[PDB]
Ligand binder design. Structure first.
Ligand SMILES: *[C@@H]1O[C@H](CO)[C@@H](O[C@@H]2O[C@H](CO)[C@@H](O[C@@H]3O[C@H](CO)[C@@H](O)[C@H](O[C@H]4O[C@H](CO)[C@@H](O)[C@H](O)[C@@H]4O[C@H]4O[C@H](CO)[C@@H](O)[C@H](O)[C@@H]4O)[C@@H]3O)[C@H](O)[C@H]2NC(C)=O)[C@H](O)[C@H]1NC(C)=O
Ligand SMILES: *[C@@H]1O[C@H](CO)[C@@H](O[C@@H]2O[C@H](CO)[C@@H](O[C@@H]3O[C@H](CO)[C@@H](O)[C@H](O)[C@@H]3O)[C@H](O)[C@H]2NC(C)=O)[C@H](O)[C@H]1NC(C)=O
Ligand SMILES: *[C@@H]1O[C@H](CO)[C@@H](O[C@@H]2O[C@H](CO)[C@@H](O[C@@H]3O[C@H](CO)[C@@H](O)[C@H](O)[C@@H]3O)[C@H](O)[C@H]2NC(C)=O)[C@H](O)[C@H]1NC(C)=O
Ligand SMILES: *[C@@H]1O[C@H](CO)[C@@H](O[C@@H]2O[C@H](CO)[C@@H](O)[C@H](O)[C@H]2NC(C)=O)[C@H](O)[C@H]1NC(C)=O
Ligand SMILES: *[C@@H]1O[C@H](CO)[C@@H](O[C@@H]2O[C@H](CO)[C@@H](O)[C@H](O)[C@H]2NC(C)=O)[C@H](O)[C@H]1NC(C)=O
Ligand SMILES: *[C@@H]1O[C@H](CO)[C@@H](O[C@@H]2O[C@H](CO)[C@@H](O)[C@H](O)[C@H]2NC(C)=O)[C@H](O)[C@H]1NC(C)=O
Ligand SMILES: *[C@@H]1O[C@H](CO)[C@@H](O[C@@H]2O[C@H](CO)[C@@H](O)[C@H](O)[C@H]2NC(C)=O)[C@H](O)[C@H]1NC(C)=O
Ligand SMILES: *[C@@H]1O[C@H](CO)[C@@H](O[C@@H]2O[C@H](CO)[C@@H](O)[C@H](O)[C@H]2NC(C)=O)[C@H](O)[C@H]1NC(C)=O
Ligand SMILES: *[C@@H]1O[C@H](CO)[C@@H](O[C@@H]2O[C@H](CO)[C@@H](O)[C@H](O)[C@H]2NC(C)=O)[C@H](O)[C@H]1NC(C)=O
Ligand SMILES: *[C@@H]1O[C@H](CO)[C@@H](O[C@@H]2O[C@H](CO)[C@@H](O)[C@H](O)[C@H]2NC(C)=O)[C@H](O)[C@H]1NC(C)=O
Ligand SMILES: *[C@@H]1O[C@H](CO)[C@@H](O[C@@H]2O[C@H](CO)[C@@H](O)[C@H](O)[C@H]2NC(C)=O)[C@H](O)[C@H]1NC(C)=O
Ligand SMILES: *[C@@H]1O[C@H](CO)[C@@H](O[C@@H]2O[C@H](CO)[C@@H](O)[C@H](O)[C@H]2NC(C)=O)[C@H](O)[C@H]1NC(C)=O
Ligand SMILES: *[C@@H]1O[C@H](CO)[C@@H](O[C@@H]2O[C@H](CO)[C@@H](O)[C@H](O)[C@H]2NC(C)=O)[C@H](O)[C@H]1NC(C)=O
Ligand SMILES: *[C@@H]1O[C@H](CO)[C@@H](O)[C@H](O)[C@H]1NC(C)=O
Ligand SMILES: *[C@@H]1O[C@H](CO)[C@@H](O)[C@H](O)[C@H]1NC(C)=O
Ligand SMILES: *[C@@H]1O[C@H](CO)[C@@H](O)[C@H](O)[C@H]1NC(C)=O
Ligand SMILES: *[C@@H]1O[C@H](CO)[C@@H](O)[C@H](O)[C@H]1NC(C)=O
Ligand SMILES: *[C@@H]1O[C@H](CO)[C@@H](O)[C@H](O)[C@H]1NC(C)=O
Ligand SMILES: *[C@@H]1O[C@H](CO)[C@@H](O)[C@H](O)[C@H]1NC(C)=O
Lengths: 130, 127, 441, 130, 38, 48, 127
C-alpha cells in the first residue's frame, strides 16, 4: 500500500474504450495538440499547428464554451440526427463509431449553437439594462 | 450569371434506368439551395419531379412517381444528377433543372429573388 | 420525450487520414545527421486495444518524402567539392598486360594526357589507369560523360556508409503501427499501436537484392499490388538472412595531381602485385533452402501443381540488368546469373562465385546530366552482407502454358524504401466532438 | 414557404447600415480575422496575422471581456467625449463615422477599463476572503 | 498644344490596370455608450 | 484621359480607348536555326 | 537628460500672427505631460500663456489673452507650437517653453520632481 508506484495510460490509450470511460481522460489528449528549405517546411508545419489550435479555440469560444472541456448547451437534440438511447451510446459505443454515424449532421449543429449563443448574449444584455 | 446545363442520353428503352446530370456554373452547389428537377410533356404540362438540398443532401420526391427516383449531388464537379428507374412511354418529356431562392439580410428584410430555369433536355423512352 | 441537448467535448480520441511533413530523429556522412534532431533514448509506444485500422502499402506518402529527402541530402553533400571540368581532353591509351589473368584482359587502360597546373600559363603531362567502362574511343579515347555534361568529383572524406534515421511527426498528428504478423501490406490490421516515431531505417541502395534489411519473424512473405497482373513487381521478404561476401583484391594506389589553386584530382597510380577480378561468394545450400521456401510460398497463389522457373534478367542498362551496390566506397555491378537459374516441379562447402566489375563514373539516381566521380580506394577491400529479400517480376504469364518463369527486377529505388515503411501510417487527430446529454445550460 | 432557399449578407457589406443594425452580425466579421524569399514573406504575413489576433484577444481579456463579442462594462460615459444621445447614435450613424468622431479619446478609455477591471478583481478577492 | 508618344518606365503599364483597386485593414474593436452596468 | 497634374508638362498622360484598334504584324523571313556544341552539354543556337 | 529649444521669427509686425515652436529632446511628447508656454517682459515679469496636453491634445489658455492663443503638437517631429494672433506692442518678451511633472510609483509614494525651463527666445513686435 506504501512505496509502490503507479503508471497510467498514454496519449491515445482510450481510443477503444467506451464513450463514458473515454470522456474521463480528455486532458491527456488535449495537452498534446500544442506540443534552409527544411527550416521553411518545419516552420510552416509549426505555424499550421498553431493556426489549427487557434481555430479550434475560436470555434469553442464562439459557442460560449470557452475555457471548458465539457460544456452543456441549450440547443435541443433533434431525433432525426440519431434515434438511439443513452444506454446504447455512453456504455456500448466508442467515439470513432459515433463520429462515423453522425458526421453527416455537423455544420447545422454548429450554426444552431452559434445562433443560440448570440441570442443568449443579446438577452443577457437586455436583462442587464434594467 | 448562373447557368445550368442539362446532359444525358437522348433515348432510353422501357424498364431501363434514365440518368440525367445538371451542371451549375456561377454559384457553388453546396450552399443552402434546393436544386429542383421538373419535366414537361404534351398533355400533362409541367410536372415537378423532385428536389435535393445541396448542403445537407436532403431529398424530396413526388409522391405520385414514388420510389423510382434517386437524386445525387457532386460538389467537386459542381453538378446534381437524377436517376429515374423503370422508365416507360409516359416518361418521354423535356427535363428542366432549376432552383428558386431569395437573397435577404440576416434577420431583416428581403433584397431580391432568383430563379434560372435552364434550357432543358429532351428525353424519349422507346426500345 | 428525449429532452436531450447537444454537449461539446474537447479532446475526443478520433483521427482521420492525412498527409504531413515528418522530421528527423537520429542517435562526415552523405546523410547529414548534423541537421537531424537527436532521438529520445527511451522510445514510447501505446497499444490500442479493440482498434482495427486499414492499411495500404502501395499508397503510403512516407515513401515519397523519404525519396525526396534522400535525393536532397545527396545533392547537398556534393556542393562543396571539386568540379572536373579540365578532365575533358584527348587521352592517349594503351592496354595493360602486366600480370593479368585471362578474364581481366582489356578491362584496364593506361591513359596519358596533358593537364593544367596552379599557374595558368603552364602545363604538365600525367597518366592514370582507367576502367574500360569509363573511356570511349574517339589510340585516342575520351571520358564517357564528356559529350553529356561536366560533373563533380566526390570529396574523399565524406563516407557512403548508411546510418539509421527515424521519422517523427509534428504535434497534432500520430503514427500508427500494425503489430500483426502475417500482414501482407494491404487490408485490415486488428492489432494496432501508436508510436512517436519509427525504428531506424538504413538507406541502403541496391538493385535485384535487398541488403542489410529487416527479416520477417514468421515465414517468407510475398507482397504485390496486384499479383494477377504481370506488370507489377513482387517483393519477397525472407525469414532468415543469406550471407554474401564481396571483395576487390587489387592493391590499388592513389596519387594526387594539382589541377589549380587548391584543387586536386585523385588518380590511380599503379597496381601492386597481380591483377584479378573482384567477385562475390554466396553459400550454395543456404540459397537452395531459401529458394525452396520461396517456391513453396509462391505455390499458394499460382496453383498447387505449377512449375516454377527462375531465369536470367531480360536486359537493358547495366544498372537494371545487374545487382549494383557500393562496397566501401567502390561501386560494384555484378552478374547474378548463377542464382536465378533453376526449375522446380511439384512432387557441402562449395559456394557460388559471381565474378563482377567496378565502376567510377556514377549516375546514382535515374537522372541524366550529373555524374559522381568516385575517387579510387587504396588497398584490397572486402565486405560481408545479409540478403533478406528479393524483387521479382513474372515474365509472360499467359494461360497457354502451365509454367511460370520469374526474373530479377529493380531500377526504381522507391521499392527499397517501401519494404521498410509497409507497417506505418500517419493520421491527424480531431478533438472536437458533439454528443447528446441531459444537462442543459 | 417550402422549397425556397435563402442566402444572407456576408462580409463588410453591412458597413453602410446603422450601428444598431451593424452590431447584429458581428460573427461574420469576427470569423474572418483568422482565415524561397516569397515563402519568407508569406510566413511573415501569417505570423503577423496570428500576432495581431493574439494581441486583440489579450487586450479583450485584460478588461474582463474574455470569450465575448458584446461585453458592457462598469466605466461611466464622460460627456466630454460625446454629447449625442442614443437616439442619434444607434439609429442615425454608422460605425465608420463613430470611429472617426471618437478617434482622439480611445487610449484613456482603455486605461480606465484596465484600472476598473483591476479594482474589481481586487474587490472580488477581498470579498472571497470572508 | 503638341502631344508626342512617351513610355520608358514600365510602372505606367501596370498602373493602367490596378487603378480601381485598393487595400485596407480591418479594426474589429470598438467602444460605444450603452445602458448596462456590470 | 488620366494624369497626376494635367497642368504640369512633366507628367505623362494615360489614354484608355473605348474600342480596340487591330494591329497585324509580322517578320516574313524564313529563318533557319543550327546548334553548335560549345562545351559539355552546352549549345549555342545560331541563324544558319 | 531632457532639453528644450525654441525657434521662430524674432521680429513680428503688429496685428500679425506670432508662431513659435519648441522642440524637446530626451523624452517623447506623446506621454502624460503638460507643455506650458511662459513669457517674461519688463515690468510685468513672468506671465503664463497656456498649456497643451500631449496625449489627449487638451488645451488651456489664459483668460487674459482671450482667444488669441492657439497650440498644436507634432509627435513625428517631437515638437509643439504656440500661435498668438493679433500681436501688439505689449507682447514684446522672452518666451520659454516649460514642463513640470512628478515621477512616482503606481498606487504608492513619490520618487522625484522634474522641471526644465528651456532657454527661450526674445521676440519683439514692430512694423
Ligand atoms: C551491411 O552492413 C555491414 C556491417 O554493418 C557492412 O560492412 C561494413 O562496411 C563498413 C564500411 O565499408 C566497414 O567499415 C570499414 O572497415 C574498414 C576495414 O576495417 C576500414 O578501413 C574503414 O575505415 C575507412 O573508411 C572510413 C569511412 O568509411 C574512414 O573514416 C576511415 O578513416 C578509413 O578511411 C581510411 O582508409 C581509407 C582506405 O585506406 C582511405 O582511403 C581514407 O583516406 C582513410 O585513410 C571502415 O571503417 C565495416 O568493417 C564492414 N563490416 C564488416 C563486418 O565487414 C556492409 O557494407 C553493409 N552493406 C551495404 C551494402 O552497405
Ligand atoms: C475492448 O472490448 C472488450 C469487449 O469487447 C472490453 O471488455 C469489456 O469491458 C466491460 C467493462 O469493463 C465489461 O463489462 C462488464 O461486464 C460484466 C459481466 O457482464 C459486468 O458484471 C460488469 O458490471 C461490466 O458491465 C465486459 O464484460 C468486457 N467484455 C468481456 C467480453 O468480458 C474492453 O474493456 C475493451 N477495451 C478497453 C480498453 O476498454
Ligand atoms: C442606405 O441608406 C438608406 C438611406 O440613407 C437606407 O434606407 C433607409 O432605410 C431605413 C430603414 O430601413 C428607412 O427608415 C424609415 O424611415 C421612415 C421615416 O419616416 C420611417 O417612417 C420608417 O418606419 C423607417 O424607419 C429609411 O427611410 C430609408 N431611407 C430612404 C431614403 O428610403 C438603406 O437601408 C441603407 N442601406 C443599407 C444596406 O443599410
Ligand atoms: C602506364 O604507362 C606509364 C607510361 O608509359 C608507365 O610509366 C613508365 O614505367 C616505366 C617502367 O615500367 C618507366 O621506365 C617510365 O619512366 C614510366 N614513365 C613515366 C612517364 O613515369 C606505367 O608503368 C604504366 N603502368 C602500367 C600499369 O602499365
Ligand atoms: C600534350 O601536348 C603536347 C603539345 O603541347 C603534345 O605533343 C604534340 O602532339 C601532337 C600530336 O598529338 C604533335 O603533332 C606535336 O608535334 C606534338 N608537339 C610536341 C612539342 O611534341 C602531346 O601529344 C600531348 N599529350 C598527349 C598525351 O596527347
Ligand atoms: C546478419 O543477420 C544476423 C542475424 O540476423 C545478424 O546477427 C544478429 O545481430 C543482432 C544485432 O542487433 C544481434 O542482436 C543478434 O543476436 C545477431 N544474431 C546472430 C545469430 O548472430 C547480423 O548482425 C547481420 N549482419 C549485418 C551486416 O546486418
Ligand atoms: C489485376 O490485374 C488484372 C489484369 O489486368 C485485372 O483484370 C483485368 O481487368 C481489365 C479491366 O478492363 C480487363 O480488361 C482484363 O480482361 C482483366 N484481365 C483478367 C485476367 O482478369 C484485375 O482487375 C486487376 N485487379 C484489380 C483489383 O484491379
Ligand atoms: C570466394 O571463394 C573462392 C573459392 O571459390 C575463394 O578463393 C580462395 O580464396 C582463399 C583465400 O583464403 C585462397 O587461399 C584460395 O587459394 C582460393 N581458391 C581459389 C580456387 O580461388 C575466395 O577467396 C573467396 N572470396 C571471398 C571474398 O570470400
Ligand atoms: C563470409 O566470411 C565470413 C567471415 O570471413 C565467413 O565466416 C567464417 O567462416 C570460417 C570458415 O568456416 C570460420 O572459420 C569463421 O569462424 C567464420 N567467421 C564468422 C565471423 O562467421 C563465412 O563463412 C563466409 N561465407 C562465404 C559464403 O564465403
Ligand atoms: C543469362 O543467361 C543467358 C544464357 O547463358 C545469357 O545469354 C548469353 O548472352 C551472352 C552475351 O554476353 C552471349 O554471348 C551468349 O551467347 C548468350 N547465351 C546463349 C546460350 O545464347 C544472358 O546474357 C544472361 N543474362 C545476362 C544479363 O547476361
Ligand atoms: C553472366 O554470367 C553468365 C554465366 O557465365 C554469362 O553467360 C556466358 O556468357 C559468355 C559470354 O561472355 C558465353 O560464352 C557463355 O557460353 C555463357 N554461359 C552460358 C552458360 O550460357 C553471361 O554472359 C554473363 N552476363 C554478361 C552480361 O556477360
Ligand atoms: C500642377 O503643376 C503646376 C505647375 O508646376 C503647379 O503650379 C506651379 O506651382 C509652383 C510651386 O512652386 C509655382 O512655382 C508655379 O508658378 C506654379 N505654376 C502655375 C502655372 O501655376 C500646380 O501647383 C500643380 N498642381 C498641384 C495640385 O500641385
Ligand atoms: C501589310 O500591308 C501590306 C500592304 O500595304 C501587305 O502587302 C501585301 O501582302 C500580301 C500578302 O497576303 C501580298 O499578297 C501582296 O502582294 C502585298 N502587297 C504589297 C503592295 O506589298 C502586307 O502583306 C501586310 N502585312 C500584314 C502582316 O498584314
Ligand atoms: C587491348 O585488348 C583488347 C582485349 O584483349 C583488344 O580487343 C584490343 O584490340 C587491344 N588493344 C590494343 C592491343 O591496342
Ligand atoms: C554521347 O556519345 C555517345 C556515344 O557516342 C552517344 O550514345 C550519346 O548519345 C552521346 N550523347 C548525346 C547527348 O548525344
Ligand atoms: C493479402 O492481400 C490481399 C490482397 O487482395 C488481401 O485481400 C488479403 O486480406 C491480405 N491478407 C491479409 C492476411 O490481410
Ligand atoms: C598493398 O601494397 C602496400 C604497399 O606495398 C603494402 O604495404 C600492403 O601490405 C599491400 N597489401 C596487401 C594485402 O598485401
Ligand atoms: C544454369 O543451369 C543449368 C542447369 O540446367 C546449368 O547447366 C548451367 O550451367 C547454369 N548456368 C550458369 C551460368 O550457372
Ligand atoms: C520555309 O522553308 C521551309 C524549308 O524549305 C519550308 O518547308 C516552309 O514552307 C517555308 N516557309 C514558308 C512560309 O513557305
Amino acid at each position: 500500500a506504501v512505496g509502490i508506484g503507479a503508471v497510467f495510460l498514454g496519449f491515445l490509450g482510450a481510443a477503444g474504450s467506451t464513450m463514458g470511460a473515454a470522456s474521463m481522460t480528455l486532458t491527456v489528449q488535449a495537452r498534446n495538440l500544442l506540443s534552409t528549405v527544411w527550416g521553411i517546411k518545419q516552420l510552416q508545419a509549426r505555424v499550421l499547428a498553431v493556426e489549427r489550435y487557434l481555430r479550434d479555440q475560436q470555434l469553442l469560444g464562439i459557442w460560449g464554451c470557452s475555457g471548458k472541456l465539457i460544456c452543456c448547451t441549450n440547443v435541443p437534440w433533434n431525433s432525426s440526427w440519431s434515434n438511439r438511447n443513452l444506454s446504447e451510446i455512453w456504455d456500448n459505443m466508442t467515439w470513432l463509431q459515433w463520429d462515423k454515424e453522425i458526421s453527416n449532421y455537423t455544420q447545422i449543429i454548429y450554426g444552431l449553437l452559434e445562433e443560440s449563443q448570440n441570442q443568449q448574449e443579446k438577452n443577457e444584455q437586455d436583462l442587464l439594462a434594467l | 450569371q448562373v447557368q445550368l446545363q442539362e446532359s444525358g442520353p437522348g433515348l432510353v428503352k422501357p424498364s431501363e434506368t434514365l440518368s440525367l446530370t445538371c451542371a451549375v456554373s456561377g454559384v457553388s452547389i453546396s450552399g443552402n439551395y434546393y436544386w429542383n428537377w421538373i419535366r414537361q410533356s404534351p398533355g400533362k404540362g409541367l410536372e415537378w419531379i423532385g428536389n435535393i438540398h445541396g448542403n445537407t443532401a436532403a431529398t424530396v420526391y413526388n409522391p405520385s412517381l414514388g420510389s423510382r427516383v434517386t437524386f445525387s449531388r457532386d460538389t467537386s464537379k459542381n453538378q446534381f444528377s437524377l436517376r429515374l428507374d423503370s422508365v416507360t412511354a409516359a416518361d418521354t418529356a423535356v427535363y428542366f433543372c432549376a432552383t428558386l431562392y431569395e437573397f435577404r439580410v440576416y434577420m431583416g428584410e428581403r433584397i431580391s429573388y432568383h430563379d434560372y430555369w435552364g434550357q432543358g433536355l429532351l428525353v424519349t423512352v422507346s426500345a | 420525450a428525449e429532452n436531450l441537448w447537444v454537449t461539446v467535448y474537447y479532446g475526443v480520441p478520433v483521427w482521420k487520414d492525412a498527409e504531413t511533413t515528418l522530421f528527423c530523429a537520429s542517435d562526415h556522412n552523405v546523410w547529414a545527421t548534423h541537421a537531424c534532431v537527436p532521438t529520445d533514448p527511451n522510445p514510447q509506444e501505446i497499444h490500442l486495444e479493440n482498434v482495427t485500422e486499414e492499411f495500404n502499402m502501395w499508397k503510403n506518402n512516407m515513401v515519397e518524402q523519404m525519396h525526396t529527402d534522400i535525393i536532397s541530402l545527396w545533392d547537398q553533400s556534393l556542393k562543396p567539392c571539386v568540379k572536373l571540368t579540365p578532365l575533358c581532353v584527348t587521352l592517349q591509351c594503351t592496354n595493360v598486360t602486366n600480370n593479368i589473368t585471362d578474364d581481366m584482359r582489356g578491362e584496364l587502360k593506361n591513359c596519358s594526357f596533358n593537364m593544367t597546373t596552379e599557374l595558368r600559363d603552364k602545363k604538365q603531362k600525367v597518366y592514370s589507369l582507367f576502367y574500360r567502362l569509363d573511356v570511349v574511343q574517339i589510340k585516342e579515347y575520351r571520358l564517357i560523360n564528356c559529350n553529356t555534361s561536366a560533373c563533380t568529383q566526390a570529396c574523399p572524406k565524406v563516407s557512403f556508409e548508411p546510418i539509421p534515421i527515424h521519422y517523427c511527426a509534428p504535434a497534432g498528428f500520430a503514427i500508427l503501427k500494425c503489430k500483426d504478423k502475417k500482414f501482407n501490406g494491404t487490408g485490415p490490421c486488428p492489432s494496432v499501436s501508436t508510436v512517436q516515431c519509427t525504428h531506424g531505417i538504413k538507406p541502403v541502395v541496391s538493385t535485384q537484392l535487398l541488403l542489410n534489411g529487416s527479416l520477417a519473424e514468421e515465414e517468407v512473405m510475398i507482397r504485390s499490388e496486384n499479383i494477377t497482373n504481370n506488370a507489377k513487381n513482387i517483393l519477397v521478404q525472407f525469414n532468415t538472412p543469406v550471407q554474401i561476401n564481396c571483395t576487390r583484391p587489387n592493391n590499388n594506389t592513389r596519387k594526387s595531381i594539382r589541377i589549380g589553386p587548391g584543387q586536386a584530382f585523385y588518380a590511380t597510380g599503379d597496381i601492386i602485385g597481380d591483377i584479378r577480378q573482384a567477385h562475390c561468394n554466396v553459400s550454395k545450400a543456404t540459397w537452395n533452402e531459401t529458394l525452396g521456401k520461396v517456391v513453396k510460398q509462391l505455390r499458394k497463389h499460382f496453383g498447387n501443381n505449377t512449375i516454377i522457373r527462375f531465369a536470367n534478367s531480360s536486359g537493358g542498362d547495366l544498372e537494371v540488368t545487374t545487382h549494383s551496390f557500393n562496397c566501401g566506397g567502390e561501386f560494384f555491378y555484378c552478374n547474378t546469373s548463377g542464382l536465378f537459374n533453376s526449375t522446380w516441379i511439384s512432387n557441402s562447402n562449395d559456394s557460388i562465385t559471381l565474378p563482377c566489375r567496378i565502376k567510377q563514373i556514377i549516375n546514382m539516381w535515374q537522372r541524366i546530366g550529373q555524374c559522381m566521380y568516385a575517387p579510387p580506394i587504396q588497398g584490397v577491400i572486402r565486405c560481408v552482407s545479409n540478403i533478406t529479400g528479393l524483387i521479382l517480376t513474372r515474365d509472360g504469364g499467359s494461360t497457354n502454358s502451365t509454367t511460370e518463369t520469374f526474373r530479377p527486377g529493380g531500377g526504381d529505388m522507391r521499392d527499397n524504401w517501401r519494404s521498410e515503411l509497409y507497417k506505418y501510417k500517419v493520421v491527424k487527430i480531431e478533438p472536437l466532438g458533439v454528443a447528446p446529454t441531459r444537462c442543459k445550460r
